[PDB]
Each structure stands twice: as structure tokens, then as C-alpha cells.
């Protein structure tokens, strides 16, 4: 219906839980490392720590539920506004051909946790295909995030 | 060249995994 004060929080609580594989309220280098290793990549022990050290505003070395609600608000400034969309795209376009297919999306799905069924995944891409090409392109992935 | 997906990034693709729609309000 309409993004309310709870619908939003629930969304972040899910992402904060996806990383907390165990669910102790603290993302470690191994946990986030497992997620970065499942999507189909290989995080570096040094970069990883430096990555979890960015949101870690406390200086402890672990991310927390509150640090989350406060991390998505510190990147929407300028050093990560239009570059974050191109990254999310890469995840979908693993092959990097210039388009996304329900298959590439199905892969990312199980890589984060939920795995949308088929008809849904098929319709999810059909609604974005403003041109009707059977797949999603870069313009769409952006035209949907630029028009508010 | 790139340098691994940043933080808000991994949250971008996961947030996309909502239900059957596309695009994030953020
Ligand atoms: Ca944990
Ligand atoms: Ca912390
Ligand atoms: Ca592709
Ligand atoms: Ca399309």
C-alpha cells in the first residue's frame, strides 16, 4: 500500500538478519564474508574488515541492528548514490551482457535467502520490461530508481 | 575495474528481493 513507519523498518530488519546468519546482533567478517562468497565473488580479509569498518561507526568491528537503520542514511549523500545502483545491477547481470534475465535474478535470490517462485519472477521482470524485450536492461533498473 | 560490492550495495539487491515488483523507494 504505502511505505509506513513499520513497513520500512521490517525491510531493514530482514537485511540485518540476512547477514547475521546466527542472529547474535553483530555482523562479523566471516558472516558478511559468507554472503559476499555466495553471490559468486571473493572478499579479501583486508578489504572485508575495511568494509565492515565503514558502517561500524562505534569502532567495535561488528555491525548492529541500529547501525543498519543508520548506515542506509549515511550513504545517500554523494559518495554512494548513483554508483550503488550500478553495483546492484552487476549482481543481476553477472555475465555483464547488458541485460538481466529471470535466471540471473533467481540466482541472486537464493544468494540472499528468499527465492521467488517462477511465475512471480517472470512477472517481476515483465512489469519492469517497459519495452517488452523479455528481460530487464540498465535504463529500466535506473529509470525506476530515478523517477522517485 | 571494480572493488567488491559495497555495503548499501548488498542491501540494494536484497531489498529488490521483496515480492514481485521492481525498483527501491529508499
Ligand atoms: Ca552475527
Ligand atoms: Ca558496531
Ligand atoms: Ca545478463
Ligand atoms: Ca525490459
Coordinates of C-alpha atoms and ligand atoms in Angstrom, one line a residue:
Chain A
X1 CA 0.0 0.0 0.0
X2 CA 2.1 2.9 1.2
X3 CA 5.6 2.8 2.9
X4 CA 4.7 3.4 6.5
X5 CA 6.9 3.6 9.7
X6 CA 6.8 -0.2 10.2
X7 CA 7.0 -1.5 6.6
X8 CA 10.4 0.3 6.2
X9 CA 11.8 -1.0 9.5
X10 CA 10.7 -4.6 8.7
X11 CA 12.6 -4.3 5.4
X12 CA 15.9 -3.4 7.1
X13 CA 15.4 -5.9 9.9
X14 CA 15.3 -8.6 7.2
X15 CA 18.6 -7.4 5.6
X16 CA 20.2 -7.0 9.1
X17 CA 19.1 -10.7 9.7
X18 CA 20.4 -11.9 6.3
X19 CA 23.9 -11.1 7.3
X20 CA 23.6 -12.2 11.0
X21 CA 23.5 -15.8 9.9
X22 CA 23.5 -16.9 13.5
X23 CA 21.4 -13.9 14.6
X24 CA 23.5 -12.6 17.6
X25 CA 23.0 -8.9 16.7
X26 CA 26.5 -8.4 15.4
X27 CA 27.8 -8.9 11.8
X28 CA 31.3 -10.3 11.8
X29 CA 33.9 -10.5 8.9
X30 CA 33.1 -14.2 8.4
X31 CA 29.3 -13.8 8.3
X32 CA 29.3 -10.9 5.7
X33 CA 32.2 -12.8 4.1
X34 CA 29.9 -15.9 3.5
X35 CA 27.3 -13.6 1.8
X36 CA 30.0 -12.0 -0.4
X37 CA 31.2 -15.5 -1.2
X38 CA 27.8 -16.9 -2.1
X39 CA 26.8 -14.2 -4.6
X40 CA 29.7 -15.5 -6.7
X41 CA 32.7 -13.4 -5.6
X42 CA 35.6 -13.5 -3.2
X43 CA 36.0 -10.8 -0.5
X44 CA 39.5 -10.1 0.8
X45 CA 40.3 -10.5 4.5
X46 CA 41.8 -6.9 4.4
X47 CA 39.0 -5.4 2.3
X48 CA 36.3 -7.2 4.2
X49 CA 37.4 -5.8 7.6
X50 CA 37.8 -2.4 5.9
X51 CA 34.2 -2.8 4.5
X52 CA 32.6 -3.8 7.8
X53 CA 34.6 -0.9 9.4
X54 CA 32.9 1.7 7.2
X55 CA 29.4 1.2 8.7
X56 CA 30.9 0.3 12.1
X57 CA 30.5 3.9 13.5
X58 CA 31.1 2.6 17.0
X59 CA 34.6 1.3 16.3
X60 CA 33.9 -2.2 17.6
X61 CA 34.3 -4.1 14.3
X62 CA 30.7 -5.5 14.1
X63 CA 27.5 -4.2 12.6
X64 CA 24.3 -3.9 14.7
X65 CA 20.6 -3.6 14.1
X66 CA 20.7 0.2 15.0
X67 CA 23.9 0.7 13.0
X68 CA 21.8 -0.6 10.0
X69 CA 19.0 1.9 10.3
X70 CA 21.9 4.5 10.5
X71 CA 24.0 3.1 7.6
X72 CA 21.5 3.3 4.8
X73 CA 21.2 7.0 5.7
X74 CA 24.9 7.9 5.6
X75 CA 25.4 6.6 2.0
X76 CA 22.6 8.5 0.4
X77 CA 24.7 11.7 0.2
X78 CA 27.0 11.8 -2.8
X79 CA 29.9 9.2 -2.5
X80 CA 27.3 6.4 -3.0
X81 CA 24.0 7.4 -4.7
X82 CA 24.2 6.6 -8.4
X83 CA 27.2 4.2 -8.0
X84 CA 25.2 1.9 -5.7
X85 CA 22.7 1.2 -8.4
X86 CA 25.3 0.1 -10.9
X87 CA 26.6 -2.3 -8.3
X88 CA 23.2 -3.9 -7.5
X89 CA 23.0 -4.2 -11.3
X90 CA 26.2 -6.1 -11.7
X91 CA 24.8 -8.6 -9.2
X92 CA 21.8 -9.2 -11.5
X93 CA 24.0 -9.0 -14.7
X94 CA 26.7 -11.5 -13.6
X95 CA 27.6 -12.2 -17.2
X96 CA 27.6 -8.5 -17.9
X97 CA 25.9 -8.7 -21.3
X98 CA 23.8 -5.6 -20.9
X99 CA 20.5 -7.2 -19.7
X100 CA 19.1 -9.2 -16.9
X101 CA 17.1 -12.5 -17.1
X102 CA 14.7 -14.1 -14.6
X103 CA 17.5 -16.7 -14.3
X104 CA 20.2 -14.2 -13.2
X105 CA 17.6 -12.9 -10.7
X106 CA 16.8 -16.4 -9.5
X107 CA 20.5 -16.9 -8.7
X108 CA 20.8 -13.7 -6.7
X109 CA 17.5 -14.7 -4.9
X110 CA 19.0 -17.9 -3.3
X111 CA 22.2 -16.0 -2.8
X112 CA 20.5 -13.6 -0.4
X113 CA 17.9 -16.0 1.1
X114 CA 14.4 -15.9 -0.5
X115 CA 13.9 -17.5 -3.9
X116 CA 10.8 -16.0 -5.6
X117 CA 8.8 -18.7 -7.4
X118 CA 8.7 -18.8 -11.2
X119 CA 5.5 -17.1 -12.4
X120 CA 6.3 -14.3 -9.9
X121 CA 9.9 -14.0 -11.1
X122 CA 8.6 -14.0 -14.7
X123 CA 6.0 -11.3 -13.9
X124 CA 8.5 -9.3 -11.8
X125 CA 10.7 -8.9 -14.9
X126 CA 7.7 -8.4 -17.2
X127 CA 6.5 -5.4 -15.2
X128 CA 9.9 -3.8 -15.5
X129 CA 10.3 -4.6 -19.2
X130 CA 8.8 -1.2 -20.2
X131 CA 10.0 -2.1 -23.7
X132 CA 8.8 -5.7 -23.6
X133 CA 12.1 -7.4 -24.5
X134 CA 11.7 -10.5 -22.3
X135 CA 14.5 -9.1 -20.0
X136 CA 15.4 -6.0 -17.9
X137 CA 18.1 -3.5 -19.1
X138 CA 20.2 -0.8 -17.4
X139 CA 17.9 2.1 -18.3
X140 CA 14.9 0.3 -16.6
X141 CA 16.9 -0.6 -13.5
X142 CA 17.6 3.1 -13.2
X143 CA 14.5 4.8 -14.7
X144 CA 12.7 3.0 -11.8
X145 CA 15.0 4.5 -9.1
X146 CA 15.3 8.0 -10.7
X147 CA 11.6 8.8 -11.0
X148 CA 11.2 8.8 -7.2
Chain B
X1 CA 37.9 -2.3 -12.7
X2 CA 35.8 -2.7 -9.6
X3 CA 36.4 -3.5 -5.9
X4 CA 33.7 -5.8 -4.5
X5 CA 30.2 -4.7 -3.8
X6 CA 30.0 -2.0 -1.1
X7 CA 27.6 -2.1 1.9
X8 CA 24.4 -0.3 0.7
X9 CA 25.0 -2.3 -2.5
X10 CA 24.4 -5.8 -1.0
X11 CA 21.4 -4.1 0.6
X12 CA 20.2 -2.9 -2.8
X13 CA 20.0 -6.3 -4.4
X14 CA 18.4 -7.8 -1.2
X15 CA 15.9 -5.0 -0.9
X16 CA 15.0 -5.8 -4.6
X17 CA 14.2 -9.3 -3.4
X18 CA 10.9 -8.0 -1.9
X19 CA 7.8 -9.6 -3.6
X20 CA 7.1 -9.2 -7.3
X21 CA 7.8 -5.5 -8.0
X22 CA 11.0 -3.7 -9.1
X23 CA 12.7 -0.5 -8.0
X24 CA 13.5 0.7 -4.5
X25 CA 11.9 3.6 -2.7
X26 CA 14.8 4.2 -0.3
Ligands
LIG1 CA1 26.3 -12.4 14.0
LIG2 CA1 29.3 -1.6 15.8
LIG3 CA1 22.7 -11.0 -18.3
LIG4 CA1 12.6 -4.6 -20.3

